[PDB]
Design a protein around this nucleic acid. Structure first.
Length: 41
DNA sequence: GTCCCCCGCGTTTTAACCGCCAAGGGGATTACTCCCTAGTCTCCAGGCACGTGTCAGATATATACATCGATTAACGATGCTGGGCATA
């Protein structure tokens, strides 16, 4: 349970976590559906 | 007819975008030579069509052997039935 010279570096440009979820919904409505499931996207 | 997974909406958090400048890898151009190709000739033996041929399977086929199915001729024993013989 220590500071231990901790350095934090994780990867969120390329990797799919990093990309933006609204970026998708932005996409979803152009099609014009009313609803987005969590599972689906 | 029920339940809960999305939309709308306010605020909190991250990283997209723009602007600026640097540096060098890699793509673009050029010049020269030399291997590799199209083009052209001759040749046939590769390839196309077909007659000829004995061998896989498949189908009976004459001949023989083994096993009954069923029929008919032959044999052992009568059963009343018919045709006559001794007694009421």
């Amino acid at each position: 349970g220590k500071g231990g010279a901790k350095r934090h570096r994780k990867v969120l440009r390329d990797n799919i976590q990093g990309i933006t979820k609204p970026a998708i919904r932005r996409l979803a409505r152009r099609g014009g559906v009313k609803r987005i499931s969590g599972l689906i996207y």
